[PDB]
Design a protein around this ligand. Structure first.
Ligand SMILES: COC1=C(OC)C(=O)C(C/C=C(\C)CC/C=C(\C)CC/C=C(\C)CC/C=C(/C)CC/C=C(\C)CC/C=C(\C)CC/C=C(\C)CC/C=C(/C)CCC=C(C)C)=C(C)C1=O
Ligand SMILES: CCCCCCCCCCCCCCCCCCCC(=O)O[C@H](COC(=O)CCCCCCCCCCCCCC)COP(=O)(O)OCCN
Ligand SMILES: CCCCCCCCCCCC(=O)SCCNC(=O)CCNC(=O)[C@H](O)C(C)(C)COP(=O)(O)O
Ligand code: SF4
Ligand code: SF4
Ligand code: SF4
Lengths: 53, 157, 185, 324, 385, 79, 92, 110, 65, 166
């Protein structure tokens, strides 16, 4: 007389549709963050080589 | 003999501690009991906590767990696997099919337990044994290892 | 596409002398042929447009140790696009070669060997017919009603020679057969 | 002059203990990723577990098949362990904390790295197993293939520095670390070192019982232990090299605050720890490469790209006369 | 072309799998799996035990979709008996079959991934599978092998505090699926190790009898629980994922979508759960209540004659078929009219999948064979009966 | 030549426990003169191919019913 | 100069002794061709690296002539490597 | 190759029996080479053993039964030749007052 | 070792603790064995066995009545 | 087909391992989260009142053993583990003189538990009974009765609790 079952009104809705987020770094800006860093770093390496010389 | 007894007792204690703190069982899973055996090593029970890392080959493993039924065709393979292991060779008969007959125990192509071959040290009963049951069986095996006076016997002889 | 339509069609379309007998029931539609017009019947049922039976589910086997044709192999079929099931069966014999159907359905290659292994009904024009389930040195066919449940040979390890050797069966506790059969039924 | 073996022992024993504890470190930090704890019952937090493993391997008398050759099957782990340990004689820690101050240090490291291929070739053949021999041969081929990428990246580093001395390279990074300008070269070097030591997504030796089973499938406790020790020492060595070339070996991060006056021997240590953490992270982050695409990748993605990086760095330095 | 002997003795390749194959050095020509190492002998042992004693045989076969296996036997016995089962039992049977489907898909996905090399999602998914094995522990006596489903209805009623826990699990199971999927679908290595591997055409799948995910991975919309719905599935709303290319990647996507649909069906069954009795009442094939057989004479007689003799199925024969997680699982019962089955052949979906390995590994790499084994989800309990 | 190999193919025939050296000739039929069975004949053929490298193919193994034919075939063989 | 190799030799000897005693302690208690091609490719590029080493170190002394004389060598062997690429010696 | 259809008459089965015996004799060096048995037994009396086993069942007249024995013999031969049968089994199968008093002394059931 | 409260004692001396979470399992209730020599791996009595495994909400002291 | 603006993004993404650092960062989110494993010797996993473990022969509160040798359990056991021998005592009532269970054959299916008309045999919640010898697993009558006596205070409570079912 006490069968287990859903509560009066039913359970809450649930999502199952593979929610997609976006936590990626960037799209194109990483190319600049690499290239400008490369140029400035090579300049710094040149200055270091001059000091060592 | 009493003067040189403390040293041999300490050596026995050290060897027993070393052998109990790192057992490398070989997953010789055969049937549904292999599911529970790999399920013990999951994130909930963490079989690795006791230094129970598994091994892929019988050359390095010092223990093996016979999880699952043992048919007639796999009996020679089981014997060959057991032979290749190094000297200690502790064997655990997980499940109810491996530790004597089993739920079949009567069909033509079934070995009535893994005790006709590969002599067993610990019998773990269940179909399939609960993960805690396998953990208790491993603890019992560790307790068995602690009773080995390896150096005392070789020094008395 | 349902049971009755297929029954009418295969009663009309099928050439005679192929189906020895047929049944129509809710359990399943049967086409019992005469162990020789099997390849032809399956080929017709596979290629015909109104009966596009494409997949062979399994090849069964029943041992009746009371009829002259002892064995009875059963071919379960299924038509995917018509969504219908046809169960064709024959009558075999312990010393007789029944034709194989590997050419039509390649999946039958292993059920063929399994039926050979369990019962002993050999087949013609089959590439292998090697034992697939029992031991390499196994003797006899186990699913026959003659074969004892415990079997004929046991397996154990003996120390005089370091290998696993077979031996005559000798059980500690015999299989207790409980005879629950009662009258009034 | 009798104190040289004291230095040698002070190098060897801590390094062997470091390998032993690195095993525990990976087995714990990989378990924490998978909602586990790892070995936490033997010692305080498993800190005694490596000792237990070592003692268990000391015991459990070896099986010693030695079917084909008594010598080579027994000498190969010795050779690979010697090669793993010997390259530490030139790595500088802070300033004078280096065993040998070679002027050809990079060439010596290159020779040692390329010379470890035999340890998995003679060992592979010595075991009478087709699955062991063929897998060991393929692993040797992979290491040999990535050796050239390692060498080309070393040339890229050497162009900026101007000398083969290892201790001089770190002093060349006073202005900035080499990870800033040529970061993609650092990434390529790290991936190649992953492939060189058979670790993370290239470790087909531990591919269970596939086409590759491993060169150490049939080895006793101690031979397998020696191979394991040697290749984890190689892992530590390559992490140290990667953090010594493209990162300051002992130099502070940016020496702006005042607390960066701490000894430089620990900067090297924390950087090596960071790279070891990346090693283990990559291992328990990605699946494996099949051997066919691993070879194609190593020959068509890392050789031309490292060659292009060599050419670009050399041209840029020559054009602006930013040469040492 | 030299020949090497596979056959590892560990569950890191599912165990019990000889698989002798031909090698040109890097490309496999013909692979011959040697099944039979797990031929326990159930099919012979079925005929010696009554219709109730033979139920636990079906849990052992395909021992990861336990309640999806005895369900076929129960349906076959019901069809042979003209037994009508109450609605609540049908709903809970559907719910537990969906739980079996989820368990099988999780285990198959993670075992296949660990075969590839990805070992971290393995423990995550077994952490999530703990929660469902606990549900199995609750309703039945045992975690894994649960003889919950009987020919009449189910063995025992659900505990009071079960549906709340099941819904609480389903609240976060979708997020767990997303977490497991983000590590593999979007990954680069996973794509190059699966795409264009083991491609099967629809004609090949039909010819080789690949009913299941392999059939649906070739573009064939053949779902047995929608084409031939047995329990209350018409009321339930779900979709049938169908692949485009027969490679291993689309089978993986299909399995993920199948897990999604199983979660949806579990939610629907939890919502639409009627009251009433669980065991049948038309025929006498159900035990009397233990609070009833102790004060009634006819009830005690029925209890005695059912737990010794069992119910006698009238003489007939049939082939049932349910949608097991592996594929189509069917039981071919032949009844002699007595209380023991005359012949009970078990159509294992993994048998055909394993035989169809020879043409799938045609001109592939050797390490390309373990992924083909993983993608077809073979357990050797069902293959060797 | 035939004489060199006859002295050796006569020796192997003595091990069949049915053939008496008092009833053997260079012209001696196995089935008729020696009374050998057809199975005994094929065992004799089997003993012949073990004498040397040749296998005595199936097609030509049924035209050596007489000992002289077998001797001629063995002598006139490359192997 | 060469006095920095004596510590290396002694270190090698001590490492050999330790490795020997490590395994001395427990006693107290079918043909393929791609491999050969990739090995030759490694040999060629190993010679490339061997030639690269003197060039990179002595690069400030020689400017715009040594660089181009090395780029010509790189171009020749890049043509060779491209020929290896198309002839199916890199993919399997 | 594929399984031939059953023989129509006994003379067609007789050539099949001879062909099976021929193949068994052709393959007999392989067993002696891959199972490492030279001092225990010589190849010549293996011929006698095979002939005895093939002549014991010589009274069967039915062509179908003879064909089935040939089939089973071929399966056994392929099992032995291939690495299926295991050592000390081929040699196991191959290579007073009165009987009543012995049988009485050993057991009741003889 | 430490937790929210302490739930009863045992004739064998081991003490049973109990912690309460909010929504996730883990660190609910455990046992601190009185002894330390391998603790026999099984020392809980029949009354406290049910409470430890969440079989019953009875403490075990209440299970005696 | 490409527009010189999408090929740039696709080439860059395949060159900077963005889809790999995505998973790399994903794997790290559980590193600092609380763990899930349990200290088994101290805290054990949650069971259910219906758990089927080591068998036990319970007896009446008066002291008489509850088994009446009806042999329903022996006749319903699918594994054929139970062997029973009965005899009329000099008291007059029927009882068991030899009731043993082969724990190696037993599969813990609970058929024997639900076949008793008097609830003589039950499966206790004890899942830790691994032994060292095979002959010890053959549970005779005395060992099984001792098991029933040991777990009576909890077996009876388990039976009373889930008595609303079955
Ligand atoms: C991959 O499979 C394997 C594992 O799983 C990860 C292992 O753990 C292992 C375990 C290996 C080890 C624990 C190596 C540890 C060995 C030792 C600690 C002994 C050698 C070390 C020394 C002699 C140095 C000790 C001296 C000091 C610390 C001096 C102090 C100042 C192996 C071999 C393996 O193959
Ligand atoms: C804080 C210190 C941290 C130190 C460590 C740094 C972080 C390391 C983290 C490593 C994590 C990832 C490790 C994964 C291991 C395996 C990854 C290999 C993947 C791979 O090889 O794919 C290749 C592409 O990637 C590649 O090619 C890789 C090389 C990319 C180099 C970048 C070159 C860009 C040049 C831009 C120059 C800019 C300046 C110009 C003036 C080929 O791709 P595929 O074969 O799979 O697909 C079809 C292409 N045909
Ligand atoms: C190591 C090798 C492994 C395999 C070894 C072999 C194992 C299986 C052996 C086969 C066992 C059998 O019985 S299978 C073979 C049994 N079949 C027969 O014996 C045919 C009946 N006999 C006749 O036809 C004639 O009497 C005949 C005697 C032939 C000649 O006499 P004729 O010329 O007047 O015809
Ligand atoms: S004990 Fe049970 S679960 Fe384990 S192999 Fe035997 S039947 Fe399967
Ligand atoms: S069913 Fe219960 S009462 Fe009957 S014989 Fe078995 S244990 Fe005794
Ligand atoms: S649990 Fe099942 S197998 Fe075990 S004794 Fe009871 S009825 Fe028999």
């Amino acid at each position: 007389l006490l069968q287990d079952g859903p509560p009066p009104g039913g359970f809450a809705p649930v999502r199952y549709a593979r929610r997609i987020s976006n936590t990626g770094p960037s799209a194109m800006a990483m190319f600049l963050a690499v290239s400008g860093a490369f140029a400035w770093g090579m300049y710094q390496v040149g200055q270091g080589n001059k000091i060592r010389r | 003999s009493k003067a040189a007894e403390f040293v041999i007792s300490k050596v026995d204690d050290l060897m027993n501690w070393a052998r109990t703190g790192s057992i490398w069982p070989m997953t010789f899973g055969l049937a549904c009991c292999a599911v529970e055996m790999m399920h013990t090593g999951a994130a909930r029970y963490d079989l690795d906590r006791f230094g129970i890392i598994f091994r892929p080959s019988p050359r390095q493993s010092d223990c093996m767990i016979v999880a699952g039924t043992l048919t007639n065709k796999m009996a020679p393979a089981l014997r060959k696997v057991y032979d290749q292991m190094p000297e200690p060779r502790w064997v655990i008969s997980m499940g109810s099919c491996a530790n004597g007959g089993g739920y079949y125990h009567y069909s033509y192509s079934v070995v009535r337990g893994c005790d006709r071959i590969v002599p067993v040290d610990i019998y773990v009963p269940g179909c399939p044994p609960t993960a805690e049951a396998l953990l208790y069986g491993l603890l019992q095996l560790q307790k068995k290892i602690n009773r080995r006076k390896d150096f005392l016997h070789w020094w008395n002889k | 596409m349902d049971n009755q339509f297929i029954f009418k069609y295969s009663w009309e379309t099928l050439p005679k002398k192929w189906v020895k007998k047929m049944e129509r029931s809710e359990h399943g539609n049967r086409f019992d042929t005469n162990t020789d017009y099997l390849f032809q019947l399956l080929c017709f049922l596979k290629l015909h447009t109104y009966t596009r039976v494409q997949v062979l589910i399994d090849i069964c086997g029943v041992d009746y140790p009371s009829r002259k044709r002892r064995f009875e192999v059963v071919y379960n079929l299924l038509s995917t696009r018509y969504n219908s099931r046809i169960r064709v069966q024959t009558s075999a014999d312990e010393v007789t070669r029944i034709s194989s159907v590997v050419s039509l359905f390649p999946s039958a290659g292993w059920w063929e060997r399994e039926v050979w292994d369990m019962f002993g009904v050999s087949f013609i024009n089959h590439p292998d017919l090697r034992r697939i389930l029992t031991d390499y040195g196994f003797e006899g066919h186990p699913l026959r009603k003659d074969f004892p449940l415990s079997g004929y040979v046991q397996v154990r390890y003996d120390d005089p020679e370091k290998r696993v050797v077979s031996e005559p069966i000798e059980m500690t506790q015999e299989f207790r057969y409980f005879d629950f059969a009662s009258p009034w039924e | 002059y009798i104190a040289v073996p004291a230095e040698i022992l002070g190098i060897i024993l801590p390094l062997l203990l470091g390998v032993a504890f690195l095993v525990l470190a990976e087995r714990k930090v990989m378990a924490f990723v998978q909602r586990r704890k790892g070995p936490d019952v033997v010692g305080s937090f498993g800190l005694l577990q490596p000792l237990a493993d070592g003692l268990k391997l000391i015991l459990k008398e070896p099986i010693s098949p030695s079917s084909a050759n008594f010598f080579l099957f027994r000498m190969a782990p010795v050779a690979t362990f010697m090669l793993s340990l010997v390259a530490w004689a030139v790595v500088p820690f802070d300033y004078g904390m280096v065993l040998s101050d070679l002027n050809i240090g990079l060439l010596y490291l290159f020779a040692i790295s390329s010379l470890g291929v035999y340890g998995i070739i003679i060992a592979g053949r010595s075991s009478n197993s087709k699955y062991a021999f063929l897998g060991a041969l393929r692993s040797a081929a992979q290491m040999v293939s990535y050796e050239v990428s390692i060498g080309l990246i070393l040339i890229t580093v050497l162009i900026c520095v101007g000398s083969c001395n290892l201790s001089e390279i770190v002093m060349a990074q006073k202005q900035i670390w080499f990870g800033i300008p040529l970061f993609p070269v650092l990434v390529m070097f790290f991936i190649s070192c992953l492939a060189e030591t058979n670790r993370a997504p290239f470790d087909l030796p531990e591919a269970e019982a596939e086409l590759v089973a491993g060169y150490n499938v049939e080895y006793s406790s101690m031979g397998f232990a020696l191979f394991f020790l040697g290749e984890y020492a190689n892992m530590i060595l390559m992490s140290g090299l990667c953090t010594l070339f493209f990162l300051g070996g002992w130099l502070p991060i940016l020496d702006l605050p005042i607390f960066k006056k701490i000894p430089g021997s620990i900067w090297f240590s924390i950087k090596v720890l960071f790279f070891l953490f990346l090693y283990i992270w990559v291992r328990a982050a990605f699946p494996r490469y099949r051997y066919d695409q691993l070879m194609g990748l190593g020959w068509k993605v890392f050789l031309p790209l490292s060659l292009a990086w060599v050419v670009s760095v050399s041209g840029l330095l020559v054009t602006f006369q930013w040469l040492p | 072309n030299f020949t090497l002997n596979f056959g590892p003795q560990h569950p890191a390749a599912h165990g019990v799998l000889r698989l002798v194959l031909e090698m040109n050095g890097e490309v496999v020509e013909r692979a011959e799996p040697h099944i039979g190492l797990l031929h326990r002998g159930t099919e012979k042992l079925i005929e010696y035990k009554t219709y109730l004693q033979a139920l636990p045989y079906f849990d052992r076969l395909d021992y990861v979709s336990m309640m999806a296996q005895e369900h076929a036997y129960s349906l076959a016995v019901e069809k042979l008996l003209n037994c009508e089962v109450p609605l609540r039992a049908q709903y809970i049977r559907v719910l537990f079959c969906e739980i079996t489907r989820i368990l099988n898909h999780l285990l198959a996905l993670t075992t296949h991934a660990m075969d590839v090399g990805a070992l971290t999602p393995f423990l995550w998914a077994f952490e999530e599978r703990e929660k469902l094995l606990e549900f199995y522990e609750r309703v039945s006596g045992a975690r894994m092998h649960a003889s919950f489903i009987r020919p009449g209805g189910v063995a025992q009623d659900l505990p009071l505090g079960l549906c709340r826990d099941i819904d609480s699990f389903t609240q976060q199971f979708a997020s767990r699926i997303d977490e497991l999927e983000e590590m593999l679908t979007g990954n680069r290595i996973w794509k190059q190790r699966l795409v264009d591997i083991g491609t099967v055409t629809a004609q090949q799948a039909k010819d080789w009898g690949f009913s299941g995910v392999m059939l649906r991975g070739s573009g064939v919309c053949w779902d047995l629980r929608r084409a031939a719905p047995y329990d209350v599935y018409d009321q339930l709303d779900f979709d049938v994922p169908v692949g485009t290319r027969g490679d291993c990647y689309d089978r993986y996507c299909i399995r993920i979508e199948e897990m999604r649909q199983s979660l949806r069906i579990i939610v629907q069954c939890l919502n639409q759960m009627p009251s009433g009795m669980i065991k049948a009442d038309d025929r006498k094939l159900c035990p009397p209540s233990r609070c009833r057989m102790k004060l009634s004479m006819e009830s005690l007689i029925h209890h005695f004659e059912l737990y010794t003799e069992g119910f006698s199925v009238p003489a007939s024969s049939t082939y049932t078929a349910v949608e097991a997680p592996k594929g189509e699982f069917g039981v071919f019962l032949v009844s002699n009219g007595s209380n023991r089955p005359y012949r009970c052949k078990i159509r294992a979906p993994g048998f055909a999948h394993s035989q169809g390995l020879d043409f799938m590994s045609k001109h592939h790499m050797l390490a390309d064979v373990v992924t083909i084994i993983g993608t077809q989800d073979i357990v050797f309990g069902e293959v060797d009966r | 030549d035939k004489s060199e190999v006859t002295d050796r193919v006569l020796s192997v025939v003595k091990n069949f426990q049915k053939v008496d050296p008092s009833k053997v000739t260079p012209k001696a039929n196995f089935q008729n003169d020696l009374g050998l069975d057809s199975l005994d004949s094929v065992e004799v053929v089997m003993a012949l191919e073990e004498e040397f490298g040749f296998e005595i193919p199936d097609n030509e193994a049924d035209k050596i019913q007489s000992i002289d034919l077998a001797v001629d075939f063995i002598a006139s063989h490359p192997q | 100069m060469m006095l920095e190799f004596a510590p290396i030799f002694i270190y090698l000897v001590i490492s050999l002794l330790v490795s020997l005693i490590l395994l001395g302690v427990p006693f107290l208690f079918r043909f393929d061709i791609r491999f050969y091609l990739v090995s030759i490719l490694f040999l060629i590029f190993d010679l490339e690296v061997t030639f690269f080493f003197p060039w990179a170190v002595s690069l400030n002394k020689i400017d715009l002539f040594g660089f181009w004389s090395m780029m010509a060598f790189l171009f020749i062997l890049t043509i060779g490597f491209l020929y290896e690429w198309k002839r199916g010696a890199l993919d399997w | 190759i594929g399984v031939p259809p059953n023989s129509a008459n006994l003379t067609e089965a007789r050539r099949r029996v001879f062909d099976f015996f021929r193949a068994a004799c052709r393959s007999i060096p392989t067993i002696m080479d891959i199972y490492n048995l030279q001092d225990v037994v010589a190849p010549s009396q293996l011929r006698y053993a095979i002939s005895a086993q093939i002549r014991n069942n010589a009274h069967i007249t039915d062509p179908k039964v003879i064909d089935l024995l040939i089939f089973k013999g071929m399966e056994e031969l392929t099992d032995i030749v291939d690495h299926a049968k295991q050592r000390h089994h081929i040699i196991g199968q191959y290579v007073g007052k009165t009987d009543f008093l012995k049988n009485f002394y050993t057991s009741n059931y003889f | 070792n430490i937790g929210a409260t302490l739930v009863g004692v045992d004739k064998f001396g081991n003490k049973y603790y109990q912690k309460l979470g909010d929504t996730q399992y883990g660190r609910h209730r455990w046992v601190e064995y009185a002894s330390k020599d391998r603790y026999n791996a099984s020392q809980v009595p029949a009354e406290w066995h049910g409470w430890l495994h969440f079989i019953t909400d009875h403490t075990g002291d209440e299970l005696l009545s | 087909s490409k527009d010189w603006n999408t090929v740039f993004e696709r080439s860059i993404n395949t060159l900077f391992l963005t889809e790999m650092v995505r998973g790399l960062s994903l794997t790290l989110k559980y590193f600092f989260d609380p763990k899930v494993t349990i200290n088994y010797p101290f805290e054990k996993g949650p069971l259910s009142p219906r758990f089927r473990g080591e068998h036990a022969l319970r007896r009446y509160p008066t002291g008489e053993e509850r088994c009446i040798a009806c042999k329903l359990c022996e006749a319903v056991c699918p594994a054929q583990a139970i062997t029973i021998e009965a005899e009329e005592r000099e008291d007059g009532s029927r009882r068991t003189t030899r009731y043993d269970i082969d724990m190696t054959k037993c599969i813990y299916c609970g058929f024997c538990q639900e076949a008793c008309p008097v609830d003589a045999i039950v499966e206790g919640p004890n899942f830790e009974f691994a032994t060292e010898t095979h002959e010890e697993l053959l549970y005779d009558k005395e060992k099984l009765l001792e098991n029933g006596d040991r777990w009576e205070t909890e077996i009876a409570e388990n039976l009373r609790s889930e008595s609303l079912y079955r």
